[PDB]
Design a protein around this motif. Structure first.
Motif, PDB file in Angstrom:
ATOM      1  N   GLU A  26       0.831  -1.192   0.000  1.00 19.78           N
ATOM      2  CA  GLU A  26       0.000   0.000   0.000  1.00 19.78           C
ATOM      3  C   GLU A  26       0.873   1.252   0.000  1.00 19.78           C
ATOM      4  O   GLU A  26       1.824   1.354   0.773  1.00 19.78           O
ATOM      5  N   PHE A  28       0.861   5.825  -0.866  1.00 23.10           N
ATOM      6  CA  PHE A  28       0.034   7.018  -0.769  1.00 23.10           C
ATOM      7  C   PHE A  28       0.580   8.096  -1.694  1.00 23.10           C
ATOM      8  O   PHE A  28       1.786   8.167  -1.934  1.00 23.10           O
ATOM      9  N   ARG A  31       3.281  14.298  -1.553  1.00 19.82           N
ATOM     10  CA  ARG A  31       2.923  15.707  -1.431  1.00 19.82           C
ATOM     11  C   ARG A  31       4.108  16.611  -1.759  1.00 19.82           C
ATOM     12  O   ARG A  31       3.981  17.836  -1.757  1.00 19.82           O
ATOM     13  N   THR A  57      -3.788   4.978  -1.463  1.00 18.85           N
ATOM     14  CA  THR A  57      -4.779   5.613  -0.604  1.00 18.85           C
ATOM     15  C   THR A  57      -5.542   6.713  -1.338  1.00 18.85           C
ATOM     16  O   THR A  57      -5.081   7.236  -2.352  1.00 18.85           O
ATOM     17  N   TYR A  58      -6.715   7.053  -0.815  1.00 20.40           N
ATOM     18  CA  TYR A  58      -7.567   8.075  -1.414  1.00 20.40           C
ATOM     19  C   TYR A  58      -7.898   9.166  -0.401  1.00 20.40           C
ATOM     20  O   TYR A  58      -8.562   8.910   0.606  1.00 20.40           O
ATOM     21  N   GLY A  59      -7.433  10.382  -0.675  1.00 23.70           N
ATOM     22  CA  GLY A  59      -7.694  11.498   0.219  1.00 23.70           C
ATOM     23  C   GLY A  59      -9.008  12.195  -0.085  1.00 23.70           C
ATOM     24  O   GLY A  59     -10.068  11.572  -0.057  1.00 23.70           O
ATOM     25  N   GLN A 170      -6.815  -3.606   9.884  1.00 21.53           N
ATOM     26  CA  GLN A 170      -6.152  -2.384  10.305  1.00 21.53           C
ATOM     27  C   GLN A 170      -4.871  -2.966  10.902  1.00 21.53           C
ATOM     28  O   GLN A 170      -4.872  -4.118  11.328  1.00 21.53           O
ATOM     29  N   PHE A 171      -3.786  -2.204  10.930  1.00 22.57           N
ATOM     30  CA  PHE A 171      -2.547  -2.735  11.492  1.00 22.57           C
ATOM     31  C   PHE A 171      -2.754  -3.102  12.958  1.00 22.57           C
ATOM     32  O   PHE A 171      -3.651  -2.576  13.623  1.00 22.57           O
ATOM     33  N   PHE A 210      -0.918   7.067  15.202  1.00 20.94           N
ATOM     34  CA  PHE A 210      -1.851   6.317  14.375  1.00 20.94           C
ATOM     35  C   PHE A 210      -2.707   5.393  15.228  1.00 20.94           C
ATOM     36  O   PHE A 210      -3.921   5.312  15.046  1.00 20.94           O
ATOM     37  N   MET A 213      -5.542   7.019  17.236  1.00 23.84           N
ATOM     38  CA  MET A 213      -6.645   7.442  16.380  1.00 23.84           C
ATOM     39  C   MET A 213      -7.400   6.283  15.738  1.00 23.84           C
ATOM     40  O   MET A 213      -8.470   6.482  15.162  1.00 23.84           O
ATOM     41  N   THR A 214      -6.850   5.079  15.830  1.00 21.86           N
ATOM     42  CA  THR A 214      -7.492   3.916  15.228  1.00 21.86           C
ATOM     43  C   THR A 214      -7.902   2.864  16.250  1.00 21.86           C
ATOM     44  O   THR A 214      -8.285   1.754  15.885  1.00 21.86           O
ATOM     45  N   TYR A 262       1.792  -1.757   4.868  1.00 25.22           N
ATOM     46  CA  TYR A 262       1.628  -0.313   4.921  1.00 25.22           C
ATOM     47  C   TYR A 262       3.051   0.206   4.859  1.00 25.22           C
ATOM     48  O   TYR A 262       3.680   0.457   5.887  1.00 25.22           O
ATOM     49  N   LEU A 264       4.191   3.079   3.698  1.00 24.32           N
ATOM     50  CA  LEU A 264       4.371   4.510   3.944  1.00 24.32           C
ATOM     51  C   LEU A 264       5.367   5.032   2.913  1.00 24.32           C
ATOM     52  O   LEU A 264       6.156   5.935   3.189  1.00 24.32           O
TER      53      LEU A 264
HETATM   54  N1  LIG Z   1      -5.280   2.243   8.221  1.00 24.12           N
HETATM   55  C1  LIG Z   1      -5.861   3.422   8.424  1.00 24.12           C
HETATM   56  O1  LIG Z   1      -6.503   3.705   9.436  1.00 24.12           O
HETATM   57  C2  LIG Z   1      -5.687   4.444   7.302  1.00 24.12           C
HETATM   58  C3  LIG Z   1      -6.351   5.666   7.384  1.00 24.12           C
HETATM   59  N2  LIG Z   1      -6.213   6.611   6.348  1.00 24.12           N
HETATM   60  C4  LIG Z   1      -6.901   7.920   6.484  1.00 24.12           C
HETATM   61  O2  LIG Z   1      -7.159   8.443   5.130  1.00 24.12           O
HETATM   62  C5  LIG Z   1      -6.500   9.733   4.998  1.00 24.12           C
HETATM   63  C6  LIG Z   1      -6.075  10.062   3.559  1.00 24.12           C
HETATM   64  O3  LIG Z   1      -5.059   9.168   3.085  1.00 24.12           O
HETATM   65  P1  LIG Z   1      -3.586   9.751   2.825  1.00 24.12           P
HETATM   66  O4  LIG Z   1      -3.669  10.745   1.733  1.00 24.12           O
HETATM   67  O5  LIG Z   1      -2.664   8.602   2.656  1.00 24.12           O
HETATM   68  O6  LIG Z   1      -3.304  10.511   4.234  1.00 24.12           O
HETATM   69  P2  LIG Z   1      -1.880  11.167   4.596  1.00 24.12           P
HETATM   70  O7  LIG Z   1      -1.189  11.516   3.332  1.00 24.12           O
HETATM   71  O8  LIG Z   1      -2.083  12.234   5.603  1.00 24.12           O
HETATM   72  O9  LIG Z   1      -1.132   9.931   5.249  1.00 24.12           O
HETATM   73  C7  LIG Z   1      -0.271   9.171   4.416  1.00 24.12           C
HETATM   74  C8  LIG Z   1      -0.266   7.748   4.878  1.00 24.12           C
HETATM   75  O10 LIG Z   1       0.126   7.642   6.262  1.00 24.12           O
HETATM   76  C9  LIG Z   1      -0.606   6.524   6.858  1.00 24.12           C
HETATM   77  N3  LIG Z   1      -1.571   7.067   7.830  1.00 24.12           N
HETATM   78  C10 LIG Z   1      -1.946   8.346   7.994  1.00 24.12           C
HETATM   79  N4  LIG Z   1      -2.844   8.408   8.989  1.00 24.12           N
HETATM   80  C11 LIG Z   1      -3.028   7.170   9.439  1.00 24.12           C
HETATM   81  C12 LIG Z   1      -3.814   6.601  10.440  1.00 24.12           C
HETATM   82  N5  LIG Z   1      -4.605   7.359  11.191  1.00 24.12           N
HETATM   83  N6  LIG Z   1      -3.763   5.261  10.643  1.00 24.12           N
HETATM   84  C13 LIG Z   1      -2.965   4.478   9.907  1.00 24.12           C
HETATM   85  N7  LIG Z   1      -2.204   5.004   8.948  1.00 24.12           N
HETATM   86  C14 LIG Z   1      -2.217   6.332   8.706  1.00 24.12           C
HETATM   87  C15 LIG Z   1      -1.394   5.894   5.705  1.00 24.12           C
HETATM   88  O11 LIG Z   1      -0.597   4.901   5.059  1.00 24.12           O
HETATM   89  C16 LIG Z   1      -1.603   7.041   4.777  1.00 24.12           C
HETATM   90  O12 LIG Z   1      -1.783   6.547   3.451  1.00 24.12           O
HETATM   91  C17 LIG Z   1      -5.367   9.681   6.006  1.00 24.12           C
HETATM   92  O13 LIG Z   1      -5.000  10.996   6.435  1.00 24.12           O
HETATM   93  C18 LIG Z   1      -5.968   8.927   7.152  1.00 24.12           C
HETATM   94  O14 LIG Z   1      -6.719   9.794   8.005  1.00 24.12           O
HETATM   95  C19 LIG Z   1      -5.407   6.323   5.216  1.00 24.12           C
HETATM   96  C20 LIG Z   1      -4.740   5.093   5.139  1.00 24.12           C
HETATM   97  C21 LIG Z   1      -4.882   4.157   6.181  1.00 24.12           C
END
Ligand SMILES: NC(=O)C1=CN([C@@H]2O[C@H](COP(=O)(O)OP(=O)(O)OC[C@H]3O[C@@H](n4cnc5c(N)ncnc54)[C@H](O)[C@@H]3O)[C@@H](O)[C@H]2O)C=CC1
Ligand SMILES: Cc1cc2nc3c(=O)[nH]c(=O)nc-3n(C[C@H](O)[C@H](O)[C@H](O)COP(=O)(O)OP(=O)(O)OC[C@H]3O[C@@H](n4cnc5c(N)ncnc54)[C@H](O)[C@@H]3O)c2cc1C
Ligand SMILES: Cc1cc2nc3c(=O)[nH]c(=O)nc-3n(C[C@H](O)[C@H](O)[C@H](O)COP(=O)(O)OP(=O)(O)OC[C@H]3O[C@@H](n4cnc5c(N)ncnc54)[C@H](O)[C@@H]3O)c2cc1C
Ligand SMILES: NC(=O)C1=CN([C@@H]2O[C@H](COP(=O)(O)OP(=O)(O)OC[C@H]3O[C@@H](n4cnc5c(N)ncnc54)[C@H](O)[C@@H]3O)[C@@H](O)[C@H]2O)C=CC1
Lengths: 281, 268
Positions: A26, A28, A31, A57-59, A170-171, A210, A213-214, A262, A264
């Motif tokens: 996976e 992302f 930026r 991932t999808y923002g 989820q991890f 992370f 928040m999860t 994941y 990153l």
């Molecule tokens: N496994 C999870 O819970 C994930 C949650 N997301 C959510 O979707 C949003 C949009 O995706 P991006 O553009 O990639 O965000 P981002 O560009 O702010 O974050 C980049 C990457 O960091 C990791 N990440 C960021 N926040 C996370 C979280 N709370 N838990 C686990 N991994 C996290 C993910 O791999 C994510 O693709 C993220 O900001 C996040 O809030 C995205 C990917 C995984």
């Protein structure tokens, strides 16, 4: 004694599983120019491992472009992520067909987060709009917004019944949690594999964020494992790789033949872990 | 409650000299029970070994134990060297025989050192039997002799088959050897070099391990992670089996040993 012989058998069984383990990566959308450079380098590196597929991932987007850049640069099955945030069913169907006619037949259906539609509805939608390989999210340690464990569990079955091809967790760092959850699943009637999502931890601070928040738990032994390493990136990486390799060893022995990483956007850690799994160039 | 010690070797180049001191400063913060420095007949001689020991002592204030061999060295020379060390604060010596290029065996050196002063003495032990030993039985009887002659502790040759170490420790106890049998741990980041070492000392490399490094000849970073994983696993197993002391063959590198010690609870 036992612990000694056990590790030998465990390491040997892992050495023999070399060749029949599927992995997915996976990424992302970058930026910065620096991160873009890093991403495409990790993709090139990880592609040599011939993963089952890779996702983006999808923002709320370059997601579509990157998917495209991957499918034609490496020719790997690229599965774009899709949420129900800031988008109407009409738009969703638009995007859906917009992907299918682009060679994209695999999508990770997710609800998304806000700072009224559930993932299940999107699954049915993609199935109503066409026939994609739908991948949804599973939560071994219960999703925060879930009423109860069983409620959250019942939702997964709902998403699977909706047409979900497979679930990606989820991890997690508590292997027991995953195992018992996977049991709860089959014991619930879900007939798809609950592919564990692995988060190789090199940056503990970020990882702890992370987790909070999860609703993911950081076992004490892990917290102690990284304690005092705030300024030791190199040691954190060795400790993180050790934890991930051990986790994937135990899971492999338990029958798990699929892993989602994941990354990153970083390749080395996931690359090394895959190596220990027998997944090599 | 875990004690650790690190082994380094005299640098033969300016670059290795730099690497070594960086590792000494890095590892010293872990407050090892002691640190030791090897001896190379045709690779540094004892002055280079002596030099490093003095450097470590003056710079870190850590107990530094030089390795001393009795090959191609007369008894009188050995006494002179021993006395020189003792009067300069060096009270711990790793008494070794050294490879034959008979004269005197390690047990003879142990006896000779105890005559000069009440030195703290460490001797070599081989879980997989010394290659020149007449038998495993005789090699064990020899360890007994070295301990009976005054050896304070035994430090094993490296090993990758943890059970070989465990079985060996049990044989030592059954033999009446009461001193501590400290396992020598070799963190592997360079498998080719480790295999060469192992092949020369009859140390077995389990099939799974050889497979783990297969295909990483040009991937230093993956070898490091895989090696660290193997090492951390070993110490964890050993720790659960009552091992309270570890001796690391750092090969003058600190990262791997530092990380392993961290996972063992040994932190600055
Ligand atoms: N496994 C999870 O819970 C994930 C949650 N997301 C959510 O979707 C949003 C949009 O995706 P991006 O553009 O990639 O965000 P981002 O560009 O702010 O974050 C980049 C990457 O960091 C990791 N990440 C960021 N926040 C996370 C979280 N709370 N838990 C686990 N991994 C996290 C993910 O791999 C994510 O693709 C993220 O900001 C996040 O809030 C995205 C990917 C995984
Ligand atoms: C592999 C993976 C990839 C991810 N990728 C992204 C990404 O690219 N972009 C992004 O924005 N987010 C991403 N996320 C995060 C995810 O979108 C959030 O966790 C979010 O909170 C929604 O979860 P969901 O997709 O599982 O939706 P759902 O399956 O709907 O679950 C969310 C909650 O709704 C509850 N629920 C479901 N149906 C009902 C109902 N009918 N009544 C009441 N409660 C109900 C569930 O119990 C649960 O608490 C990812 C997560 C994983 C595990
Ligand atoms: C922790 C450690 C550190 C080391 N550091 C160094 C170093 O810095 N420099 C270096 O040169 N080498 C070093 N070595 C390698 C070592 O010197 C060689 O293994 C050497 O061949 C034997 O040394 P020893 O001290 O074990 O001798 P010994 O204990 O004398 O053993 C050697 C052999 O002689 C046998 N033996 C003993 N007594 C008799 C007898 N009377 N008749 C017949 N056989 C007998 C033993 O069974 C054995 O086979 C080290 C090894 C270890 C495990
Ligand atoms: N623990 C052991 O088994 C040791 C064995 N020795 C032997 O004594 C010889 C002379 O010493 P040096 O001049 O330092 O040799 P060297 O200069 O060739 O080697 C330098 C250092 O590398 C490490 N090393 C080399 N071979 C090794 C081996 N087989 N096992 C573990 N570590 C090894 C040691 O720290 C040694 O001091 C070495 O070549 C080696 O054969 C030396 C130190 C330790």
């Amino acid at each position: 004694f036992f612990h000694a012989s056990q590790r030998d058998a465990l390491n040997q069984s892992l050495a023999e599983v070399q060749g029949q383990i599927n992995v997915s990566f996976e990424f992302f959308p970058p930026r910065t120019s620096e991160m873009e450079q890093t991403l495409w380098n990790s993709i090139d590196r990880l592609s040599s491992l011939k993963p089952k597929f890779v996702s983006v991932t999808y923002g709320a987007d370059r997601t579509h472009s990157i998917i495209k850049g991957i499918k034609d640069r490496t020719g790997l099955e690229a599965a774009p992520h899709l949420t129900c945030i800031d988008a109407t069913p009409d738009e969703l169907r638009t995007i859906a067909r917009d992907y299918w006619n682009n060679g994209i037949r695999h999508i990770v259906a997710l609800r998304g987060d806000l700072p009224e539609m559930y993932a299940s509805d999107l699954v049915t939608l993609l199935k109503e709009v066409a026939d994609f390989d739908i991948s949804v999210a599973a939560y071994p340690e219960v999703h925060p917004e879930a009423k109860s464990a069983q409620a959250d569990l019942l939702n997964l079955k709902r998403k699977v019944d909706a047409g979900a091809n497979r679930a990606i967790t989820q991890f997690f760092f508590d292997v027991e949690s995953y195992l018992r959850f996977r049991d709860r699943c089959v014991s619930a009637g879900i007939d798809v594999e609950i592919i564990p999502g692995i988060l190789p931890v090199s940056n503990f601070k970020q990882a702890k964020k992370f987790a909070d928040m999860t609703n993911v738990r950081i076992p004490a032994w892990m917290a102690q494992m990284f304690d005092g390493l705030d300024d030791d990136a190199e040691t954190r990486k060795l400790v993180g790789a050790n934890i991930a390799m051990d986790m994937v060893k135990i899971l492999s022995r338990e029958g798990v033949k699929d892993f989602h990483f994941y990354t990153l956007n970083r390749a080395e850690m996931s690359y090394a872990i895959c190596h220990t799994l027998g997944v090599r160039p």
